Amino acid sequence: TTLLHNAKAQVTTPCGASHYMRHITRQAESALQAGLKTAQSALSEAAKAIETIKTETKNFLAGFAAAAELAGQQTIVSEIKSAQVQDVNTLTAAQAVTTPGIIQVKPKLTIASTAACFNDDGSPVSGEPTLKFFVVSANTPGTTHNELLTICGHGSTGTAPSTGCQNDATSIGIKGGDFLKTAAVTTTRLASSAGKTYPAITSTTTIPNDKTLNKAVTAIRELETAVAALDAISD
Amino acid sequence: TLLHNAKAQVTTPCGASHYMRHITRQAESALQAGLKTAQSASEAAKAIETIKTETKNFLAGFAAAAELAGQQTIVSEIKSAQVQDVNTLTAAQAVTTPGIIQVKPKLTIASTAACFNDDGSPVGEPTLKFFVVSANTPGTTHNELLTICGHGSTGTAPSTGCQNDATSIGIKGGDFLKTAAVTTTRLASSAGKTYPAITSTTTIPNDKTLNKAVTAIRELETAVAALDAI
């Protein structure tokens, strides 16, 4: 039998989650090839093999596409989680509100120098199965001086917020920080009255959201049954 | 089998994701037909041999098209990211609790599956179009986006117009990202028909991610064509 899920994989990062999904597609492909080869060697048993492959193609390709789509989503999640507001040094308040010294909210991203989640040479960089995905939402700003994502006060113009903001509005800058908050969501397959099933993911205010994730997991489940039916050909 | 929706006008990231899914739906129909022919009945052996030799290229480009669809789905959601406007406040109270002026991240979260409605329906040489995001550029003087907002009157919304006046201070917000389209059109040359390399080194996704997927999509096109012959 073909093991779609990698037991020796510990998903702890978005890039890890994307490689786990790609592993599903690689394993799904091997099961399809073996079914194709079994029907090819039988050239009746070849008629029922081709029949099983054709009947399961819709379920196979829908879940294959869903695993790939989830790998794509996690790849973008792994890049966007780096989004930050940059610190800006304080400036005497009268000059901080107009040209040439206006204090700016500066977006910044950290862009991979390779294909995201991959090395330059092309290699990856990261019981019932568990599907784990990472999701983003708006970060929560601070609520007092010297906390993230706030206007930074200091008695001395020119001060870097990293050295400590004060309750002092003589000069003002910006203490930056992460624009997003990243969290994991998980669903662990379990035996159901008629087979196996994934509990729903709850994540209503994130990117991706749970409607997007649950739709894809449902299709991954159809890939798993399609692969099991494919393994039954050579068994 | 026509993998490419010729009558598609891709102008949004969600439209780009649906174009990618059209490719996968068309690719499926080519394999299904190829399997239906094989079901009928050495000819049966010929089809199987093809379907098998081309499965590797087929699933590689199929996965790349669906991967790109997943990437464009997130692009369509995060492109909503903004820094919120914050009303001005007397400067001495603006630097500490409880009035501290905050840089407030904000997203717009789809209430459905992104790029789909509740019912589940979607919301020449071919061209592949994708949308990418990059850091937005802040303004350089008062009342321009992504700057501290001065005003003479405390409690003033920045939409009233920021001034060269630091009596009260707030935040003039705006989009956190800029979103632009990248494209590549299949080109006839002595190399056959190939998609030119995209250059985009400062965006999410970047060109190395995109160019790798595009190369695989070209291999899908070649696989669908061989599947059509049988």
Residue numbers in the entry:
A (entry chain A): 22 to 64, 94 to 176, 186 to 294
B (entry chain B): 23 to 63, 94 to 175, 186 to 292
From the reporting publication:
The structures of VSG21 and VSG545 were also determined, both harboring closely related folds and biochemical properties that distinguish them from other VSGs. Of note is the fact that both structures were obtained with proteolytic removal of the bottom lobe (contained in the C-terminal region of the NTD sequence). This cleavage occurred spontaneously during crystallization experiments performed with full-length VSG21 and the NTD of VSG545 that had been produced by limited proteolysis with Endoproteinase Lys-C (LysC). In contrast, for VSG21 and VSG545, the cleavage in the crystallization drops produced a truncated NTD missing the bottom lobe sequence but maintaining the 3-helix bundle and top lobe of the protein. No sugar is seen in the VSG21 electron density, and no predicted site for N-linked glycosylation (Asn-Xaa-Ser/Thr) was found in the sequence of the NTD. VSG21 and VSG545 are more similar to each other than these other VSGs, however, distinguished from them by the tightly twisted nature of the top lobe and, directly beneath it, the presence of a second three-stranded beta-sheet perpendicular to the axis of the 3-helix bundle. VSG21 and VSG545 align well to each other in the top lobe but not to the other VSGs with beta-sheet top lobes. Superpositions with predicted models from AlphaFold (which were accurate enough to solve the experimental structures by molecular replacement) show possible conformations of the full NTD for each protein. In this subdivision, we split the A3 class from Cross into A1b and A1c (which correspond to classes N5 and N3 in Weirather, respectively) based on differences in the top lobe architecture (e.g., the smaller top lobe beta-sandwich in A1c compared to A1b and the presence of a second beta-sheet over the middle lobe in A1c that is not present in A1b).
Long-term immune evasion by the African trypanosome is achieved through repetitive cycles of surface protein replacement with antigenically distinct versions of the dense Variant Surface Glycoprotein (VSG) coat. The mature VSG proteins are attached to the cell surface by a GPI-anchor, and consist of two main regions: (1) a large, N-terminal domain (NTD) of roughly 300–400 amino acids that is most distal to the membrane and (2) a smaller, membrane-proximal C-terminal domain (CTD) spanning 80–120 amino acids beneath the NTD that harbors the GPI-anchor. Therefore, at the heart of antigenic variation in the African trypanosome are the NTDs of the VSGs. These large subdomains are elongated folds centered on a three-helix bundle scaffold.
